[PDB]
Amino acid sequence: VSDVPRDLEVVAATPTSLLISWDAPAVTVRYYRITYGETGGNSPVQEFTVPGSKSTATISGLKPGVDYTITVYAVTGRGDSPASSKPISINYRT
Numbered sequence: 001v002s003d004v005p006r007d008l009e010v011v012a013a014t015p016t017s018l019l020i021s022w023d024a025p026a027v028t029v030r031y032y033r034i035t036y037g038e039t040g041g042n043s044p045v046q047e048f049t050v051p052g053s054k055s056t057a058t059i060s061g062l063k064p065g066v067d068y069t070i071t072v073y074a075v076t077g078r079g080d081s082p083a084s085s086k087p088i089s090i091n092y093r094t
Contacts, residue, residue, distance in 0.1 A: 004074045021056040033073040
């Protein structure tokens with residue numbers, strides 16, 4: 001049943017750049033929404049949607065040596081029904 005959020009890990013980092021990768025089942029997923037922000041509360045960093053076509057992603061513009069909270073909102077649907085998914089979030093030091 002539940003199996004949209006999984007395999008979320010970091011492959012490596014680079015000068016002002018990080019590479020995160022998760023999963024994408026075969027169910028025609030409507031779209032994905034990746035949002036991230038450095039712990040602070042001064043202002044959210046950024047977010048971006050994708051047709052679930054990209055299984056990986058390259059994010060940059062962050063600050064090395066700091067806590068970072070990530071949240072992936074996976075929305076699926078068969079046509080237009082209230083098909084609500086199960087979003088998830090986790091904190092990690094990057």
